[PDB]
Design a protein around this ligand. Structure first.
Ligand SMILES: Nc1nc2c(ncn2[C@@H]2O[C@H](COP(=O)(O)OP(=O)(O)O)[C@@H](O)[C@H]2O)c(=O)[nH]1
Ligand SMILES: COc1ccc(-c2[nH]nc3c2-c2cc(OC)c(OC)c(OC)c2CC3)cc1
Ligand SMILES: [Ca+2]
Ligand SMILES: [Mg+2]
Lengths: 424, 61
């Protein structure tokens, strides 16, 4: 019956995790108390994938809230749908991880991780058939980045044949907490390459630009950025939450998206970008969602090639028109799909749209231009690490320079692995 | 290995601090009293002199 266990970790993790659950609890008819008050019953067919059944059969998310400080988490639970979350599923330390990967992965996080795996175990033991885990987190902080990849190291150990799937927010100098972010993120990516099956790369650069250039928000807030993420995340997961000709689970998704096991970082895109009264026509949905301006990862798809693509349209619309338009975008732009993976673009449609939009289209691209993101983070990293700058924050927690060059190395390789398939 | 290294280096830092402190207070108490030792012994060759002058003054008759 194919559940996912959702884990949100850190400040960014739990803020984005929080909106995602209100966004889709609205989509499933669940109120802030956990009680279902929807019209359809398609709202309840795949409900079990994200929600456990409850009291007078209310619905609690299958979510685990993780942090090394309580601040964000108190904020979540005193926020809107903060009541729906199982209070036992609030696992938190007190010291924080100081924007420090090592504190999350080796010291502070190490102390807390066992308590989290107790909650993952009780959430997952109550699963007739669990299919995988999805983790939300940033990679530039300490908790979501350092502890989050520790958690994945552990979940992989206890559950080696489940899918591990993350939504990962990349640091960008444009929208930065601290200067050590490329360090934290290079170290997280070394982990993600090994221990996840699929990672959606949400770049904070791109969310800023969409907010500024497109949505016309002069100075965007983190809430404005997480508006775009909770809409993409709702989008990316509608197949798992709603029934269709597609019997969509994490493993089938990974099987068709990932040709080579390391190359599993996806460029999400969304259309329309909203912060609106004419529904977009299908020809625009598909022109927009493939436009670089609607990508969440801040890489130009025309700078690389799509290994694989997965698109979904939400609303009631011409199933033939999306077929036609989808097939048409491939031939206007066949230079940008790989000749050696036949039929590498797959398209689903859902009759139920997101709140407020009558027609929406979400895009998932395994493009070799995602390399730009890692090239970007790698330049920044080297820029500091050549002068060994800010390293004391990490050597103070047991880490050695060697661990750093290995992480620099594994990511420069991943960039080579991506360039070689751009040339084929 | 990493967390037991963070522990080991925090401890060796306390260790060396603890020792550098103790060794300097010992070198200081020594040096200070040597200077007071030296100061008083100076004053006592003055006491011993103040009598070889007074005793010399009896060595007349
Ligand atoms: N998009 C987005 N990014 C965030 C948010 N909060 C923090 N960040 C980013 O996350 C990184 C900092 O990590 P953070 O989640 O604050 O630290 P942690 O609590 O130790 O995991 C920085 O790159 C911030 O730009 C958020 O709500 N939305
Ligand atoms: C590149 O060629 C392919 C891509 C995906 C699949 C597949 N198989 N099973 C599923 C999916 C699948 C597709 C989804 O997008 C269409 C999808 O929505 C995000 C989606 O939701 C997460 C899923 C999950 C259900 C098959 C071929
Ligand atoms: Ca501690
Ligand atoms: Mg922060």
């Amino acid at each position: 019956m194919r559940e996912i266990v959702h884990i949100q970790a850190g400040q960014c993790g739990n803020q984005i995790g929080a909106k995602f659950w209100e966004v889709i609890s609205d989509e499933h008819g669940i109120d802030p108390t956990g009680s279902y008050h929807g019209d359809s019953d398609l709202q309840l067919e795949r409900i079990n994938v994200y929600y456990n059944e409850a009291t007078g059969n209310k619905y609690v998310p299958r979510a685990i809230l993780v942090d090394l400080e309580p601040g964000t988490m108190d904020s979540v639970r005193s926020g809107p749908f903060g009541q729906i979350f199982r209070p036992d599923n609030f696992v938190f330390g007190q010291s924080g991880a100081g924007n420090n990967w090592a504190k999350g992965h080796y010291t502070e996080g190490a102390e807390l991780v066992d308590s989290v795996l107790d909650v993952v175990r009780k959430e997952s033991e109550s699963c007739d058939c669990l299919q995988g885990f999805q983790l939300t987190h940033s990679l530039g902080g300490g908790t979501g980045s350092g502890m989050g990849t520790l958690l994945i190291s552990k979940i992989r150990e206890e559950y080696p044949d489940r899918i591990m799937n993350t939504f990962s927010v990349m640091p960008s100098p444009k929208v930065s907490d601290t200067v050590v972010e490329p360090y934290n993120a290079t170290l997280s990516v070394h982990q993600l390459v090994e221990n996840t099956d699929e990672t959606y790369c949400i770049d904070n650069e791109a969310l800023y630009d969409i907010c500024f250039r497109t949505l016309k928000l002069t100075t965007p807030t983190y809430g404005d950025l997480n508006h775009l993420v909770s809409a993409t995340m709702s989008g990316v997961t509608t197949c798992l939450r709603f029934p269709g000709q597609l019997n969509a689970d994490l493993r089938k998704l990974a099987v068709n998206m990932v040709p080579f096991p390391r190359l599993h970082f996806f460029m999400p895109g969304f259309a329309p970008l909203t912060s609106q009264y004419r529904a977009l026509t299908v020809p625009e949905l598909t022109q927009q969602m493939f436009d670089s301006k609607n990508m969440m990862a801040a890489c130009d798809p025309r700078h690389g090639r799509y290994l694989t693509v997965a698109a979904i349209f939400r609303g009631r619309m011409s199933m033939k028109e999306v077929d036609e338009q989808m097939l048409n975008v491939q031939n206007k732009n066949s230079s940008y799909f790989v000749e050696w993976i036949p039929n590498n673009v797959k398209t689903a449609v859902c009759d139920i749209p997101p709140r407020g939009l009558k027609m929406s289209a979400t895009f998932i691209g395994n493009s070799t231009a995602i390399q730009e993101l890692f090239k970007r983070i790698s330049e920044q990293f080297t820029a500091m690490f050549r002068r060994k700058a800010f390293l004391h924050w990490y050597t103070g927690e047991g880490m050695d320079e060697m661990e750093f060059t290995e992480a620099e190395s594994n990511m420069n390789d991943l960039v080579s692995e991506y360039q070689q398939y751009q040339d084929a | 290995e990493v967390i037991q290294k963070a522990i080991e280096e925090n401890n060796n830092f306390i260790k060396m601090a603890k020792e550098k402190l103790a060794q300097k207070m010992e070198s200081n108490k020594e040096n200070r009293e040597a200077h007071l030792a030296a100061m008083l012994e100076r004053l006592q060759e003055k006491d011993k002199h103040a009598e070889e002058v007074r005793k010399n003054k009896e060595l007349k008759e």
